Every structure is written in C-alpha cells, then in structure tokens.
Curated annotation (Swiss-Prot):
Secreted effector that irreversibly inactivates host MAP kinases by catalyzing the dephosphorylation of the phosphothreonine residue in the pT-X-pY motif present in MAPKs, via a beta-elimination reaction leading to a dehydrobutyrine residue. Disulfide bonds: none annotated. One of its GO terms (cellular component) is extracellular region. The gene is spvC. Its EC number is 4.2.3.-. This is MAPK phosphothreonine lyase.
Length: 203
C-alpha cells in the first residue's frame, strides 16, 4: 500500500525533501471571483467547476492528470466564515495554478450553508491529495511540492490578515499551521499525528 511505502522510506523521503529548492507555483489570474463561483458548471484553468444544489460546496476537479490511487490524505482550511470570500480570492491563484499538486478541492458556498442551515466554523476548504505515481507511491518530489503548496496557502492567508476559523474535531495540525489541518478518512487525533504523511508535512 501507499502507507507501507511511506513507513519504509520515511527517513529517505524526508532527507530528499529537506534538501530540495523552494517550489515555484505559477499562479492563475484568469480565474473566477467568489461570487462567480456561486459559475454553476464551467471550466477554469483545466479545473471542472461544479455547483449543484445537493451540498454546500463548489467542487473543482482538474480534467487531468497524479496517477496513483487515493490513500485518504486530505487537508482542510479553516477561516472565519465572514472572510471566506477574501480567503477564496487570496488563494485562487494557487488553487487554480497549473503547478498545484492538488487536482481536486472544494470551497463552501456561503449562500447554500445558510439555506441548508449548516454551521460554518471551519473546513471551508477541502484539499484532496493522491499519490502521483502509478504504483500509488508518493514521490519525494511530489510530497515536497505538496508541503510547499500547503505552506504557501498558510502564508497567503496570514499575509492577507484572514482571521482563522475552528479546526475540525477530527483533524490535527502543528502549532505553526493557523488555517490548515490534516486528516485521513481511511484511518483518535493521537494516531493521526503519527501518520508518516502528516509528519513529513510538518517536521
């Protein structure tokens, strides 16, 4: 499995990642603004956008490319509900970037959260991660890119004075992540902190 490989290459992956140069993400400009996202079924930078009325989100899935099978890894971004539009705009360049390692994500539609009487304290953004290789093994290059990406998101939000939200109860995050949090749906918060993926993303 994917996790088996991470465990047996734990130090090797870490050692390669920690010596790689900073990643560069060519951010997108020709993207929709938040109100645009609420369009309904359009295309933007290769990402198929979809807003149906059965949930409180707007989904984005890149028609491409990651060749591996889902291993359950994903991140959530939590901000004050009032600031979702600002957060979205600030992160749009990276989220729609051709260099982004995230092929699938979603953002809550505040109109729909109100119509469906849902609470929105956090996890307004969800980022799905999948091994890049066909054999379902994460490569050192990809993990480094993903970590770099997640950190750019963190920095962009704080530089924009976005007020943080409330981390989901089932997620875990280090003290230096103010918006991002992690969880693996395929497997206690204590156990998540031990996941190799999570530790390679934080230590």
């Amino acid at each position: 499995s994917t996790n088996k490989h991470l465990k047996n290459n734990f130090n090797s992956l870490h050692n390669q990642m920690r010596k790689m140069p900073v990643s560069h993400f060519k951010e997108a400009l020709d993207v929709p603004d938040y109100s645009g996202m609420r369009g309904f079924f359009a295309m933007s930078q290769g990402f198929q956008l979809n807003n149906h009325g059965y949930d409180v989100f707007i989904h984005a899935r890149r028609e491409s490319p990651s060749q591996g099978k889902f291993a359950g890894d994903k991140f959530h971004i939590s901000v004050l509900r009032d600031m979702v539009p600002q957060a979205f705009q600030a992160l749009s360049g990276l989220l729609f970037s051709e260099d982004s390692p995230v092929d699938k994500w979603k953002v809550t539609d505040m109109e729909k959260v109100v119509q469906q009487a849902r609470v929105s304290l956090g996890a307004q953004f969800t980022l799905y991660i999948k091994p890049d290789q066909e054999n379902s093994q994460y490569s050192a290059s990809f993990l480094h890119k993903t970590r770099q990406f997640i950190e750019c998101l963190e920095s962009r939000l704080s530089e924009n004075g976005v007020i943080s939200g409330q981390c989901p109860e089932s997620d875990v995050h280090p003290e230096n992540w103010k918006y991002l949090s992690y969880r693996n749906e395929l497997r206690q918060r204590q156990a998540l902190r031990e996941e190799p993926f999570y530790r390679l993303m934080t230590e």
